[PDB]
Ligand binder design. Structure first.
Ligand SMILES: COc1cc(CC(=O)c2ccc(C#N)cc2)c([N+](=O)[O-])cc1OC
Lengths: 231, 41, 274, 255, 231, 41, 59
């Protein structure tokens, strides 16, 4: 008999350990694999697909309108929308990105925020999206916003504008759980010129916003999510 | 990494897939779209 | 192997190695052979025991907490009744290990935890129950347990360990800092605010470790005390500082008590006393 | 023909000279440098103003009297209102920098006194209230006036007993930090070159002070018979290898 | 199943053991290392840096003066200061050397003791530092002191004198905790000639003393320190 | 020294660094100072 | 001044565009030299040609 010494920890059940164990069904032959499209290997693959952001979460209950960002005709230099960038909470909390991000404690990388115009073809507009890196407050007027990372979007044949939110940080990782030290900054949109509608047109004009991750992206330290419960 | 058991199910976790191709989800379009070129030409 | 002292004889030169100028900020490597006649001797020593890997490389108790097994009927606040308990992870609660870590400014390493749980039945009991403890790590952002029986203890993603009371739990954790190293000190705030907190308490939001006893209650009450030990491995340290001199008053801040005894011993006599 | 005693330092359009120095210290034997790609995280291309911010800025002179306890400045705080350097600090989310600190104090061969000049990385101050009281933002951001260790405590401020380094450690061991002495009979100036020291590649220059500079009288000042019982102490600091990143609107800080 | 026999000790938790253990965070990718100046590998590196000794610990409370060694003009052959060499106690107890030394039970090697003159440039003086190896009492007059290891220091342009305290012992290791068998001896300083001040000068003259270890140095058997507590 | 676990954090202590260079602390001066030569020339 | 005396002065050149400095701080923000009186008795501060147009009028 080989002399051994059991170390502390013996007998413990660490839900995270990865060891071998005897099979309760010896010689069982599992069903053959067949081809199935859409195989997923890493969650980082799917958070690169963008989903709609319920930016206009100003309603009494959940509704399609929560995803519609109102745009008003003949308004000038005024603010269209705003939000901080705690991707694990706020407007982002229910999105695919936010949902997956919440399964991890740390995140890093660049975000892909885009806007798709849905107003009549014969209408025009020029907006300005702006990312305000941490350190200062969320911009209160276009001038303040324009001083930082931004994109002037000209509504046209190409319906969608894609503004990237470049990873701008000192520490190389932030917490998914809203934390001040690791805040990501603010996102805002303003009128560069104004929205102009054609004759015989009075209907409301809306914007659809999407959020996804760039290949830049990283997530660490898997944990349970606050997005489900029972009992 | 010596397998003490006879069946495959007994072995431990597989280790990183190292495939990582998001395009089947991010770009499932019929006609290839080049970044920088008109989305709708 | 290495020589501890070379053989050096009489001296009469213009090269005066023992005359320096400490205001330069340097500590010239003067040796005994520079001021006295010496013989040859060897080190027979490598200094392996003073390597930072060894210095911080042994288990030190970093926290003691308590939970108990008893009837939960009627209890409104489970957390308060200690039907389950919390530990806001931190390494500056118990001073022994803290002073060592604070011998440096930045520190990087993996951690090996060892958790000991001991039972106690202060009141009348007919036997010693065989309780199983569950220590679940709750990273910042994960839902916190509210009752010793929340859905939260399912621990589907949170890592957690189950072990018998009286026994010991052990596992290691990789370096989880968000930066390249952990800060033992931080001359800063979370943001530019007039009232916000100062110090590393701002950087140390490592989450909690929730402890509970899986067993239902027995007729009597059992008091389980939990002790967490920490051992660093694969150590790296930067910017050594002056050792802690005065007693600590709080987790994370450098504060010291008002009206503290002098730290420097006072001579029983002269400045000439031996 | 040359000597540690005589030196010249030129950064930008500013040059300081000294004929009574005692060499110079380069913290942890490392000269300041820019942030290399391999260590970078922030994807923004940085800004290097070079000569317009990497120059000597001279703070208000302090007055060393027979009862002075010492002074403490913090960087980059101490230069927040200094020309273009200051402006860049508030207009950018991030930034990193090294410095060349030059402390001046001259007397005569009849005077006597010894100042300890040290640079302390991450000098987390302690609250004089003890317990778990914090130290309000304002009090660790004195600006170029710095903190006077012989001034009285104030609500929300740090403790100031020179003896405990404002952090619960003894003065005598402050020498483990890169330092130099200005011993009037030998010295006239003290010079310390500080490289960027942090656990992150770049950081916020307003919410975090990387190092604090302390000038502490150890051997008290003594002047010849009937002479003015004081000497001025002047601090001149020059940033080097300064990088700014993430430009946006100007930051607004507490008070 | 491989036949084994568990040895005594099985189950124990030795705070000093060094074994492997399962990782609770599998596949976690720690943050990249970046360069940070001032890396420390061994405590023996830092105790070679000298710090100030509170030699004049004759005060009612701790204070800057505890580090100032008074020197008096026109005094002759008189003693300036004295101390035994229990580096883990007395004046040394709070110094970096003493502080680190106390984290270990045994020590050996040579000590580096230096004095820096701070008196006016136009003043002069000649002092004599002396190390008295164990076996006899601390010297009571200059003559007695001069009979052992010593250095005659001439105050001048070079402000600091560095007297080494060569490892002088039979047993090759001493205890850090004050122990008689392992006593290290005594350190004293006297006036070789006297301190002379120039005209118009009356201020007090002080000496600053430092202590550090030579590369000679060795420390063994790590233990807890008496320099901290709570509870 | 066979590593039973998959992750690096699982392995035991690193073993002596064997670097030992005190000069970055004892001699962080700009101009090299030779023992024996005038500290202040 | 006497050999046994000491002093540290600061000379400063303020290029065109702003007023003549009114206090040391203002002056120090531009081209300058910190002069330490010592064995070498003279300090030489150069006033580097700082101009847009490449020639100025003597008048
Ligand atoms: C065993 O209990 C755990 C403890 C910790 C915290 C940790 O390892 C740590 C160590 C040192 C410093 C510093 N300075 C900061 C944090 C983590 N964790 O951080 O993920 C998980 C635990 O159970 C998965």
């Amino acid at each position: 008999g080989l002399p051994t010494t059991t170390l502390p920890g013996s007998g413990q059940f660490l839900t995270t350990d990865d060891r071998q164990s005897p099979s309760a069904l010896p010689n069982y032959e599992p069903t053959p694999r067949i081809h199935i499209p859409g195989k997923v290997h890493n969650l980082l693959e799917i958070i690169q697909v963008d989903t709609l952001i319920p930016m206009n979460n100003t309603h009494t209950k959940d509704e399609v309108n929560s995803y519609l960002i109102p745009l008003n005709a003949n308004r000038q230099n005024e603010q269209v929308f705003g939000t901080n960038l705690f991707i694990g909470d706020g407007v982002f909390k229910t999105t695919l990105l936010g949902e997956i991000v919440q399964y991890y404690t740390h995140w890093s990388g660049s975000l892909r925020f885009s806007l798709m115009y849905t107003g009549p073809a014969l209408s025009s507009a020029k907006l300005i999206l702006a990312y305000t890196p941490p350190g200062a407050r969320g911009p209160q007027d276009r001038r303040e916003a324009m001083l930082g990372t931004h994109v002037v979007w000209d509504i046209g044949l190409q319906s969608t504008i894609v503004m990237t939110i470049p990873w701008t940080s000192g520490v190389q990782f932030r917490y998914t759980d809203p934390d001040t030290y690791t805040s990501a900054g603010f996102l805002s949109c303003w009128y560069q010129t104004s929205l102009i509608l054609p004759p015989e047109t009075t209907g409301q004009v809306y914007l659809l916003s999407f959020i996804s991750a760039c290949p830049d992206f990283k997530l660490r330290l898997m944990k349970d999510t606050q997005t489900i419960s029972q009992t | 990494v010596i397998n003490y058991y006879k069946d495959a199910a007994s072995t431990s976790s597989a280790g990183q897939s190292l495939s990582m191709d998001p395009s089947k989800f991010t770009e499932p379009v019929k006609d290839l779209m080049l970044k920088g070129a008109p989305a709708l030409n | 192997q290495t020589v501890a002292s070379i053989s050096s004889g009489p001296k009469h030169t213009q090269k005066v190695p023992i005359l320096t100028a400490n205001e330069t900020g340097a500590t010239m490597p003067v040796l005994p052979s520079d001021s006295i006649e010496t013989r040859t001797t060897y080190m027979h020593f490598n200094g392996s025991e003073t390597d930072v890997e060894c210095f911080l490389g042994r288990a030190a108790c970093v926290h003691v907490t308590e939970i108990q097994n008893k009837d939960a009927t009627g209890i409104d606040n489970h957390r308060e009744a200690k039907l389950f308990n919390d530990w806001k992870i931190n390494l500056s609660s118990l001073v022994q290990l803290r002073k060592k870590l604070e011998l440096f400014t930045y520190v990087r390493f993996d951690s090996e935890y060892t958790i000991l749980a001991t039972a106690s039945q202060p009141d009348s009991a007919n036997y010693s129950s065989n309780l199983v403890v569950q220590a679940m790590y709750v990273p910042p952002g994960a839902p916190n347990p509210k009752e010793w029986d929340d859905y939260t203890w399912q621990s589907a993603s949170n890592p957690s360990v189950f072990f018998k009371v009286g026994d010991t739990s052990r596992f290691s954790v990789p370096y989880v800092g968000l930066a390249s190293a952990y800060n033992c000190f931080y001359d800063g705030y979370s943001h530019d605010d007039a009232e916000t907190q100062y110090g590393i308490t701002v950087l140390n939001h490592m989450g909690s470790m929730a402890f509970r006893i899986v067993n239902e209650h027995d007729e009597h009450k059992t008091l389980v005390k939990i002790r967490v030990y920490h051992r660093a491995k694969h150590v790296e340290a930067w910017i050594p500082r002056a050792p802690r001199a005065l007693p600590y008053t709080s987790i994370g801040r450098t504060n010291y008590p008002k009206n503290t005894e002098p730290v420097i011993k006072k001579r029983k006599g002269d400045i000439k006393s031996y | 023909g040359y000597s540690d005693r005589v030196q010249q330092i030129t950064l930008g359009n500013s040059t300081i000279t000294t004929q009574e120095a005692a060499n110079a210290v380069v913290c942890y034997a490392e000269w300041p440098e820019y942030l290399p790609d391999v260590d970078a995280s922030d994807v923004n291309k940085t800004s290097k103003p070079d000569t317009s911010v990497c120059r000597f800025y001279t703070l208000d002179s302090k007055t060393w009297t027979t009862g002075s306890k010492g002074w403490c400045w913090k960087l980059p705080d101490a230069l927040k209102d200094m020309g273009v350097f200051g402006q860049n600090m508030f207009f950018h989310s991030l930034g990193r920098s090294g410095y060349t600190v030059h402390v001046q104090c001259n007397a005569t061969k009849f005077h006597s006194g010894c100042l300890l000049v040290v640079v302390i990385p991450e000098h987390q101050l302690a609250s004089h209230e003890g317990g778990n009281v914090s130290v309000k933002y304002t009090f660790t951001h004195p600006g170029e006036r710095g903190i006077d260790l012989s001034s009285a405590n104030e609500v929300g401020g740090p403790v100031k007993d020179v003896i405990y380094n404002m952090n619960g450690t003894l003065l005598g061991n402050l020498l483990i930090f890169p330092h130099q002495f200005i011993n009037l009979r030998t010295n006239n100036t003290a010079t310390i070159v500080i490289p960027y020291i942090n656990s992150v590649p770049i950081d916020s220059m307003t919410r975090h002070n990387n190092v604090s500079l302390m000038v502490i009288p150890i051997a008290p000042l003594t002047v010849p018979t009937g002479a003015t019982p004081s000497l001025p102490i002047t601090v001149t600091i020059a940033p080097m290898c300064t990088e700014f990143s993430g430009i946006r609107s100007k930051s607004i800080v507490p008070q």
